[PDB]
Design a protein around this ligand. Structure first.
Ligand SMILES: C/C=C(\C)CC/C=C(\C)CC/C=C(\C)CCC=C(C)C
Length: 433
């Protein structure tokens, strides 16, 4: 196999982040070379099919029992994550036009864990007044809070109600409406989607806007604010590969990167199969540049096949479940996202619940018991522990732009920030929406 002599950009790995940036570059008029050492797409975030392959990958010789249904009807994302309907990730996908090859379907339910139980996340005043997460009085205070958020307008100080969006902290905003720890817990982690409570002592603007984003997405799609493509996220690598051909430049799989040639601290090309191709910029995931990354931790994901909808979700065919750390004596949230035959990722009557979190103990599996208890009985489990990496070089000089490994969250918030960041580092300016 052979490469060209020169490309403006060379991308290594076909993970979601690489694919999306690769799409932007191509659409922006650059000659792109995109390759992957693997014989499949998505790298770490690959989708597995048929079911038999999933069993193989997890060392389950027995193979799936007939009761698992038609193997070919299974498309299992190793790292499933949902997209915020009105989010920027979706907007970036529209920009590349890869959306032309995707069928987004709204996730049926969104829940939050509390006191050992899961409740519907209340985003509307109506949902608030009917929520069992709070008592009669507090839920009414929360209702007024949502009112303020809904009516809030960044450019109209009359709606600020005396708060300084650029200076008044969210903690102060919470006090203003007299909201307790439990309400703050699900609002911050299940509505604003933060991973930690650092936002409490930061300007309220961002948080208010995040809650607005959730509400607006929900209002637009009805069931929840989350989207997931039919057939799983594996449809993205395929879409971008197809988009790639359009602008000339087909994705090359099963192609080894023998070396990343650096000249005076700056990349100038890549060598593969006794051949060299020059490039001005290089995009890749951590696995291609061990010396330009540091380990930021470990994540554990447990894929659980079920034959029944998750209890207490009103038989949702798909759902997001956030388990705030404070609710389970942890320093990191636990997540559970589930998709099923409704999104064409599993055989009829089957559901795929994937529980995840950041490792904090020597018994990672035990750490996720709080989430598994919400899923039993479980037909089969698939446990995977992954090391997380983040670049120690922003490519400013090297012109080598590495992405971060995918964290435990079950939505694209943090992945979107990485993409936007990497892009800014490459273009010199922020992606203009
Ligand atoms: C006010 C500045 C804005 C809105 C910047 C964002 C620019 C966009 C959304 C379009 C400019 C790009 C083109 C005219 C051509 C590239 C082709 C595609 C993105 C299909």
């Amino acid at each position: 196999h052979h490469m060209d002599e020169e490309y403006d950009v060379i991308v290594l790995g076909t993970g979601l982040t690489e694919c999306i940036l690769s799409g932007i570059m191509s659409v922006n008029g650059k000659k792109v070379l995109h390759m992957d050492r693997n014989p499949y797409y998505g790298g770490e975030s690959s989708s597995i099919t048929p079911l038999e392959e999933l069993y193989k990958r997890f060392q389950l010789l027995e193979g799936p029992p007939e009761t698992m249904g038609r193997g070919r009807d299974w498309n299992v994302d190793l790292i499933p994550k949902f997209l915020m309907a009105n989010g920027q990730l979706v907007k970036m996908l529209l920009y590349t036009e890869v959306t032309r090859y995707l069928d987004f379907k709204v996730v049926e339910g969104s829940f939050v864990y509390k006191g050992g139980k899961i409740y519907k996340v209340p985003s509307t005043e109506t949902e608030a007044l009917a929520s069992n997460l709070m008592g009669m009085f507090e839920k009414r205070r929360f209702r007024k809070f949502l009112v303020f958020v809904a009516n809030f307008d960044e450019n109209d100080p009359k709606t600020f109600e005396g708060v300084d969006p650029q200076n008044t902290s969210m903690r102060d905003v919470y006090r203003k409406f007299d909201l307790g720890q439990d309400v703050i817990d699900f609002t911050g982690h299940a509505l604003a989607l933060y991973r930690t409570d650092d936002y409490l002592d930061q300007p309220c603007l961002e948080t208010i806007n995040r809650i607005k984003l959730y509400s607006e997405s929900l209002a637009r799609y009805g069931k929840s604010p989350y989207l997931y493509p039919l057939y799983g996220l594996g449809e993205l690598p395929q879409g971008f590969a197809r988009l790639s051909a359009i602008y000339g430049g087909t994705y090359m799989l099963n192609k080894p990167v023998d070396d990343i040639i650096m000249e005076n601290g700056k990349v100038v090309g890549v060598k593969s199969e006794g051949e060299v191709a020059r490039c001005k910029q290089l995009i890749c995931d951590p696995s291609y540049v061990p010396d330009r990354v540091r380990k930021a931790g470990q994540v554990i994901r447990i894929i659980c096949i079920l034959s029944h909808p998750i209890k207490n979700t009103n038989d949702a065919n798909s759902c997001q479940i956030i388990i705030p750390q404070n609710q389970v004596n942890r320093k990191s949230d636990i997540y559970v996202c589930m998709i099923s035959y409704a999104h064409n990722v599993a055989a009829q009557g089957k559901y795929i619940a994937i529980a995840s979190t950041t490792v904090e103990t020597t018994d990672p599996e035990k750490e996720v018991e709080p989430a598994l208890e919400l899923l039993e009985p479980i037909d089969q489990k698939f446990v995977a522990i992954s090391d997380l990496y983040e670049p120690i070089d922003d490519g400013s000089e090297s012109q080598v732009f590495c992405s971060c490994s995918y964290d435990a969250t079950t939505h694209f918030e943090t992945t979107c920030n990485d993409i936007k960041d990497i892009y800014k580092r490459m273009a010199g300016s922020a992606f203009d929406f």
